[PDB]
Amino acid sequence: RHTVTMIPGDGIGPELMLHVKSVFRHACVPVDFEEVHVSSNADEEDIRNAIMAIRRNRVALKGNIETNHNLPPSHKSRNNILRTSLDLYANVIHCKSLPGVVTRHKDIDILIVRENTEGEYSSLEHESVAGVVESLKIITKAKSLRIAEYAFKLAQESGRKKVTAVHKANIMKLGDGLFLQCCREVAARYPQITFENMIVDNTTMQLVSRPQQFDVMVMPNLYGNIVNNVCAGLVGGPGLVAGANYGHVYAVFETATRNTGKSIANKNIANPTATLLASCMMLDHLKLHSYATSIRKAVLASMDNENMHTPDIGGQGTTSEAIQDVIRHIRVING
Amino acid sequence: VQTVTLIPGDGIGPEISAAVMKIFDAAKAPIQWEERNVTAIQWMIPSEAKESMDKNKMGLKGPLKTPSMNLLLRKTFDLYANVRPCVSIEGYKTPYTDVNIVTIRENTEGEYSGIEHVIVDGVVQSIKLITEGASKRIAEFAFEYARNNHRSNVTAVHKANIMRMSDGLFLQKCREVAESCKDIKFNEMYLDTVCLNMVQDPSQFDVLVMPNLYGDILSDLCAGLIGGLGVTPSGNIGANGVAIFESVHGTAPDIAGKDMANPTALLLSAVMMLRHMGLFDHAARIEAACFATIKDGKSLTKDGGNAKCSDFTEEICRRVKDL
Ligand SMILES: Nc1ncnc2c1ncn2[C@@H]1O[C@H](COP(=O)(O)OP(=O)(O)O)[C@@H](O)[C@H]1O
Ligand SMILES: [Mg+2]
Ligand SMILES: [Mg+2]
């Protein structure tokens, strides 16, 4: 039996965490969740306990914390505090077109590896003189090498054939140029893999017109934020795609797009897919592959049936009907 | 009858300018073309180009080959507001059909401050600069644009959750202006969410106002929804009533003389130019003349079928004459 940290978060997090437990109970998953809560308090006591809880368990499942962006810069995104404190440097999402969820684009299969601890999320900011603010984007060789090493290893291990570095180095010559140089240093050790690069501007155009061209994509923090959401939106929105946050020792799992769902919370219409697919991602990490596969095949099987779909993907069903259907498809495996 | 400085530029630049000039004349447009050759000297643009612009106040720029000429022009004329109206074109069809978005980008500042440091070896610092003045200015223009172009909504795009001080200040200015202009409906939105919803349902958006890096990306994003840079108008607004309107695509050196080019985008930039001046009648007539030509869809360029740039241009002239 494994003990895993659970941070319910705000919005749809808690209600979906209940459904993850239902599914686990039903599937006889040998995983116990130690829940830890993160309030809106300006005091960082709650978030420090969450860090420590993760240091202990090394694995967490996580909802999104809402950030009130009207408060002072002292009050930092608890989400961002967690991944930097835990040094979960690699955000990984796999946006693959789902057969049952028809969108404008098909045959999408993108692995996005995003630097997760650095760049413009460094929270370095000052006002030199009244009405003049400087934000310090930080790019280092250590972290760019590290993320490129991951992206190339992932491609090699997944049987992928191309890595694409997304950047803005024609304008950010030193910053994004350094990141891009580290991708090339690593590329020299993976001659089996094709290395290309694309400016973040042009990438978004390519994603909305011909996203079949992309395979593995590797990039700094903010461009990752953009490409993740674009690619998520292409395959049918925020309810479908699971996100992973890997450090050397720790690992936290979440919905790829990282949304609260504040405005749909407590109305039994949130899409449980992304959250469930994340729990399976966590099970694979814990080496519980048989349970991961049972739940994942159940979840994906439900997506083929349009009657089970929730509003966010063109349907009319509730969360609980989708979970009912997921559980039915584990019954046929389970008994 | 007014004069407008003309920068045909390079490659296919002359052809598409010649096509835009001929359509403007075919449509009886009260415009004179003071042709001009922008180029780096000593670094400056030539005194004749500088003088043309301070005189005429209005310009048209074809694709310029490769500091950057665009960078140069920006600092010279204080071009602070990049505007890109993206609308779906019937006939040149994409998976996105309901599109009508204006991307309003702060153009001087933000992530493109040009300030980078090697703090220590293997550690680089890039400065994103957000000021009170520039943020207030690009806000005021966005609200002014919506009024003068009859738009209902203006959305401020940001990442203030992460970059509190900088994006929060930018956002602070957009709020103040919105309070002084309650006849336009104002909402805030995170860049990642905007991107997320844009690719699912782009009809939800109207006018997007934002800092430099977000605008640079979203403008290209939107442009990709409507079919690319080859069909996209663009306009830059400067200090004391100056404005350039460009073809934002490449010079296409392959087909420079072969007459396979496509003037649509520069034309639309010219239509946009006319609208800014106040010649709405001529603008709407040429715009409609273009859309109808594209809609027929047999006499299209390689960019398309196999009909030449001249046959396309003549088709515009044929129809625009018959209002
Ligand atoms: N699981 C989900 N199911 C349905 N809609 C969702 C889901 N997650 C997010 N959304 C919707 O996608 C958008 C995500 O933005 P949002 O919830 O506001 O995240 P955030 O609070 O982090 O900015 C919202 O429209 C939200 O209602
Ligand atoms: Mg969020
Ligand atoms: Mg651009």
Residue nearest to atom 20 of ligand 1 (CA): A259
- Count of residues in chain B: 323
DSSP conformational letter for A61: E
Closest residue of chain B to A209, computed from CA coordinates: B224
Return the SS3 of B292.
Answer: helix
Say whether A135 and B96 touch across the interface (CB within 8 A): no
How many angstroms does the Cα of residue A285 sit away from the middle of ligand 2?
24
The experimental method, as deposited, was X-ray
Pair type for strands A59-62 and B31-35:
unpaired
Beta bridge partners of A6: A35, A61
Residue B5: which CATH number?
Answer: 3.40.718.10
Separation of alpha carbons B303 and B301, rounded Å = 5
Say whether A226 and B217 touch across the interface (CB within 8 A): yes
Is A57 a pocket residue for ligand 1 (Cβ < 6 Å)? no
Encoded tokens for B39:
């180029």
Any B CB within 8 A of A320 CB:
no
Mutate to test the interface with A, among B217, B229, B231 (most CBs of A within 10 A): B217
**Nearest CB partner across the interface for B163, out of A125, A168, A257:** A125
Q: Which element (helix H / strand E) includes A127? A: strand A125-129
Encoded tokens for B148:
């003068």
Q: Where are the alpha helices (H) located in B113-210, listed in sequence order?
A: 132-148, 164-179, 191-198
- Inter-chain contacts counted by CB atoms under 8 A, chains A and B: 160
Say whether B126 and A172 touch across the interface (CB within 8 A): yes
Mutate to test the interface with B, among A70, A103, A121, A125 (most CBs of B within 10 A): A125
Is A239 a pocket residue for ligand 1 (Cβ < 6 Å)? yes
Contact A70, A174 (CB under 8 A): no
Backbone angles phi, psi at B201, to 5 degrees: -150, 90
Contact A215, A164 (CB under 8 A): yes
Residue nearest to atom 12 of ligand 1 (CA): A238
All residues at 6 or more sequence positions from A117 whose CB lies less than 8 Å from its CB, including other chains? A83, A84, A87, A88, A89, A143, A221
Any B CB within 8 A of A141 CB:
yes
**Nearest CB partner across the interface for A121, out of B116, B162, B213:** B162
CA A101 to chain centre: 20
Q: Where are the alpha helices (H) located in chain B, listed in sequence order?
A: 13-26, 47-56, 69-77, 132-148, 164-179, 191-198, 212-226, 264-277, 280-296, 309-321
The b-or-e profile of A280-314 (16+ CB within 10 A means b, else e) is: bbbbebbebeebbebbbebbbbbbeeeebbbebbe
Separation of alpha carbons B166 and A226, rounded Å = 19
DSSP conformational letter for B69: H
Question: CA separation (Å) from B70 to B73, B253, B273?
Answer: 5, 19, 18
State the first-to-last Cα distance of chain B, in angstroms, to the nearest integer.
20
Total number of domains in chain B:
1
A271 is in an annotated binding site: yes
Q: Which element (helix H / strand E) includes A226? A: helix A221-234
Chain B residues whose CB is inside 8 A of the A105 CB are 95
Encoded tokens for B62:
């074809």
Beta-carbon-side half-sphere exposure of residue A168 (alpha carbons within 13 Å): 22
Chain A residues whose CB is inside 8 A of the B159 CB are 120, 222, 225
Residue A257: name the closest of A15, A93, A13, A76 by CA: A93
Q: What is the dihedral of CA B302, B200, B235, B249, to 10 degrees?
A: -30
User: Which residue type does A3 have?
Assistant: T
Say whether A233 and B196 touch across the interface (CB within 8 A): yes
Q: Where are the alpha helices (H) located in A28-118, listed in sequence order?
A: 45-57, 78-85
For this entry, resolution in Å reads 2.8
- Across the beta sheet with A109-115, the strand order is A31-35, A2-7, A59-62, A251-255, A242-246, A90-96, A109-115, A216-219, A162-167, A194-199
Encoded tokens for A281:
């991602």
Encoded tokens for B134:
């520039």
Residue nearest to atom 27 of ligand 1 (CA): A261
Out of A255, A259, A260, A269, give the residue to mutate to test ligand 1, the one with the largest number of ligand atoms within 8 Å of its CB: A259
Return the SS3 of B91.
Answer: coil
Beta bridge partners of B4: B33
Range 85-104 of A in CB contact (< 8 A) with B = 104
- Across the beta sheet with B116-120, the strand order is A125-129, A132-140, B123-131, B116-120
Encoded tokens for B239:
């200090």
User: Which residue type does A320 have?
Assistant: S
DSSP conformational letter for B92: B
User: Which residue type does A45 have?
Assistant: E
- Across the beta sheet with B81-87, the strand order is B31-35, B2-7, B58-61, B243-246, B235-237, B81-87, B100-106, B207-210, B153-158, B185-190
Contact B265, B80 (CB under 8 A): no
Q: Which atom of ligand 1 is nearest to the CA of A264?
A: 27
Q: Which ligand is nearest to the CA of A261?
A: 1
A5 is in an annotated binding site: no
Any B CB within 8 A of A185 CB:
no
Mutate to test the interface with B, among A67, A205, A225 (most CBs of B within 10 A): A205
Contact A220, A167 (CB under 8 A): yes
Say whether A105 and B95 touch across the interface (CB within 8 A): yes
Encoded tokens for B315:
């088709």
**Nearest CB partner across the interface for B163, out of A120, A200, A204:** A120
Q: Which ligand is nearest to the CA of A318?
A: 1
Separation of alpha carbons B233 and B156, rounded Å = 22
**Nearest CB partner across the interface for B199, out of A77, A125, A233:** A233
Domains defined for chain A, CATH in brackets: 1-335 (3.40.718.10)
DSSP conformational letter for A29: -
Contact B130, B169 (CB under 8 A): yes
All residues at 6 or more sequence positions from A19 whose CB lies less than 8 Å from its CB, including other chains? A272, A275, A276, A319, A320, A323
Separation of alpha carbons B83 and B184, rounded Å = 18
Separation of alpha carbons B287 and B318, rounded Å = 14
Contact A140, B122 (CB under 8 A): yes
Other C-beta atoms closer than 10 Å to the C-beta of B241 total 8
User: Which residue type does A100 have?
Assistant: G
Encoded tokens for A166:
């997304």
Is A203 a pocket residue for ligand 1 (Cβ < 6 Å)? no
Say whether A135 and B166 touch across the interface (CB within 8 A): yes
Question: Which domain does B144 fall in, by range?
Answer: 1-323
Chain B residues whose CB is inside 8 A of the A226 CB are 191-192, 195, 217
* DSSP letter for each residue of A244-295: EEE-SS-EEEEETT----TTTTTSS----HHHHHHHHHHHHHTT-HHHHHHH
Residue nearest to atom 23 of ligand 1 (CA): A259
Return the SS3 of A208.
Answer: helix
